[PDB]
Design an enzyme around this catalytic site. Structure first.
Site, PDB file in Angstrom:
ATOM      1  N   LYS A  12      11.928  -4.795 -24.377  1.00 35.54           N
ATOM      2  CA  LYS A  12      12.559  -4.482 -25.063  1.00 35.54           C
ATOM      3  C   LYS A  12      13.367  -3.564 -25.176  1.00 35.54           C
ATOM      4  O   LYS A  12      11.998  -2.291 -24.394  1.00 35.54           O
ATOM      5  CB  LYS A  12      12.114  -4.393 -26.779  1.00 35.54           C
ATOM      6  CG  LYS A  12      12.437  -5.694 -27.120  1.00 35.54           C
ATOM      7  CD  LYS A  12      10.619  -6.007 -28.237  1.00 35.54           C
ATOM      8  CE  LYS A  12      10.184  -6.958 -28.089  1.00 35.54           C
ATOM      9  NZ  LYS A  12       8.374  -7.800 -28.119  1.00 35.54           N
TER      10      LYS A  12
ATOM     11  N   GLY B 275      18.327  -3.114 -27.938  1.00 34.44           N
ATOM     12  CA  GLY B 275      18.402  -4.389 -27.532  1.00 34.44           C
ATOM     13  C   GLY B 275      17.098  -4.996 -27.132  1.00 34.44           C
ATOM     14  O   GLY B 275      15.897  -4.224 -26.975  1.00 34.44           O
TER      15      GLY B 275
ATOM     16  N   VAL C 189      15.865  -8.766 -24.247  1.00 32.23           N
ATOM     17  CA  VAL C 189      15.732  -9.578 -23.514  1.00 32.23           C
ATOM     18  C   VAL C 189      15.147 -10.954 -22.815  1.00 32.23           C
ATOM     19  O   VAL C 189      13.747 -10.822 -23.379  1.00 32.23           O
ATOM     20  CB  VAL C 189      16.503  -8.598 -21.437  1.00 32.23           C
ATOM     21  CG1 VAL C 189      16.907  -9.283 -21.051  1.00 32.23           C
ATOM     22  CG2 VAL C 189      17.555  -7.705 -22.005  1.00 32.23           C
TER      23      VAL C 189
ATOM     24  N   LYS D 288      20.520 -11.039 -23.026  1.00 35.20           N
ATOM     25  CA  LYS D 288      20.308 -10.118 -24.042  1.00 35.20           C
ATOM     26  C   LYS D 288      21.164 -10.061 -25.702  1.00 35.20           C
ATOM     27  O   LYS D 288      21.875 -10.416 -25.761  1.00 35.20           O
ATOM     28  CB  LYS D 288      20.800  -8.738 -23.359  1.00 35.20           C
ATOM     29  CG  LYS D 288      20.970  -7.561 -24.170  1.00 35.20           C
ATOM     30  CD  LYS D 288      21.254  -5.978 -23.611  1.00 35.20           C
ATOM     31  CE  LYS D 288      21.351  -5.144 -23.734  1.00 35.20           C
ATOM     32  NZ  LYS D 288      21.319  -3.758 -22.920  1.00 35.20           N
TER      33      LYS D 288
ATOM     34  N   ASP E 272      21.950   6.887 -16.447  1.00 36.31           N
ATOM     35  CA  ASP E 272      20.661   6.867 -16.314  1.00 36.31           C
ATOM     36  C   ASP E 272      20.059   5.163 -15.317  1.00 36.31           C
ATOM     37  O   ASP E 272      18.795   4.239 -15.495  1.00 36.31           O
ATOM     38  CB  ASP E 272      21.168   5.359 -17.955  1.00 36.31           C
ATOM     39  CG  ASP E 272      19.051   5.145 -18.264  1.00 36.31           C
ATOM     40  OD1 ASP E 272      18.535   6.471 -18.544  1.00 36.31           O
ATOM     41  OD2 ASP E 272      18.587   4.040 -18.666  1.00 36.31           O
TER      42      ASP E 272
END
Ligand SMILES: COc1ccc(-c2cccc3nc(Nc4ccc(N5CCN(C)CC5)cc4)nn23)cc1
Length: 300
Positions: A25, A29, A31, A50, A144
């Site tokens: 998590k 979201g 997965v 996802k 990121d």
């Protein structure tokens, strides 16, 4: 019954997607690992799925942008888009992707160190650079990069994931300023990202330097970027004071230390990525070539 014609293998049917495992998590979201079994014979490809925690207009808009971004990418070192599933009678949206058995690079390094030498680390470094070169051809800024956001297919292949923060540069612009609420991965950020919220290919190069640092620390407890920066800043500092001190530190050449056992020439690459002068940081093409030349210069 009825006739059937499938001319869109990017549309996955909800009734054939069967749960196998929860994978993780994030902020907005989660997965899961699933099996897609349209022939209903207990076989089918295994996939990663996802889904959004809360499909607000904003979160859904961002999720659809992430899907469009991933779909537009086709490269060995970028997680593979497979399609979408419109679940809950087509009132929910899920993103279908290839499943990568070894999970995040951060976890892999921590748990499979028996399998990892410097040759492997440089192979992963090279693959990350090449993925990033590929993003650059589409004018995508990742924003990121970190080992937790790179995924591992096997011993010999890693793939960039986590495109939910990705921005697209317009043709005549060289940075994207983004003003966003909530938390930032500040210990991976370039100084201009910290001070001006400016993101660019060059800020991805800075963060790539932190990724390289992470690889050569082997994700050892006390050696992580947050742990080392906090040691330097002062372990008891809290809130905005951490940010004030981190910025002042970086602006005056404070840097993560050379990891134990890290070759001086690998540390030199890190230090060159961590240039306050944005225009002086190397390109991802420069980095890929340098790293592959280091790899090739070895006797075997
Ligand atoms: C933030 O959480 C996630 C989780 C999964 C993914 C993702 C996207 C697209 C493809 C993909 N393949 C895997 N594989 C994977 C395998 C093992 C694990 N483990 C984490 C939990 N561990 C206890 C078991 C291994 C996690 C992910 N994860 N994954 C991205 C972010």
């Amino acid at each position: 019954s009825g006739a059937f014609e499938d001319r869109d293998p990017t549309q996955f049917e909800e009734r054939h997607l069967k749960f196998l495992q929860q994978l993780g998590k994030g902020n907005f979201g989660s997965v899961e690992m699933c099996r897609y079994d349209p022939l209903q014979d207990n076989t089918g490809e295994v996939v990663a799925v996802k889904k959004l925690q809360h499909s607000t207009e904003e979160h859904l808009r961002d999720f659809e942008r992430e899907i469009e971004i991933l779909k537009s990418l086709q490269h060995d070192n970028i997680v593979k888009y497979k399609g979408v599933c419109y679940s809950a009678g087509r009132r929910n949206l899920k993103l279908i992707m290839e499943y990568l058995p070894y999970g995040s690079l951060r976890d892999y390094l921590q748990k499979h160190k028996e399998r990892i030498d410097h040759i492997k680390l440089l192979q992963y470094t090279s693959q990350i650079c090449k993925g990033m070169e590929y993003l650059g051809t589409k004018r995508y800024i990742h924003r990121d990069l970190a080992t937790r956001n790179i995924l591992v297919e096997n011993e010999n292949r890693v793939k960039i994931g986590d495109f939910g923060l990705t921005k697209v540069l317009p043709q005549d612009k060289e940075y994207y300023k983004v003003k966003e609420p909530g938390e930032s991965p500040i210990f991976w950020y370039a100084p201009e990202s910290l001070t001006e919220s400016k993101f660019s290919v060059a800020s991805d190069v800075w963060s790539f330097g932190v990724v390289l640092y992470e690889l050569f620390t082997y994700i050892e407890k006390s050696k992580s970027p947050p742990a080392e920066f906090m040691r330097m800043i002062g372990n008891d500092k809290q809130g905005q004071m951490i940010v004030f001190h981190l910025i002042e530190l970086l602006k005056n050449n404070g840097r993560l230390p050379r990891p134990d056992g890290c070759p001086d020439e690998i540390y030199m690459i890190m230090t060159e990525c961590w240039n306050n002068n944005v225009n002086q940081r190397p390109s991802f093409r420069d980095l890929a070539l340098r790293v592959d030349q280091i790899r090739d210069n070895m006797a075997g």
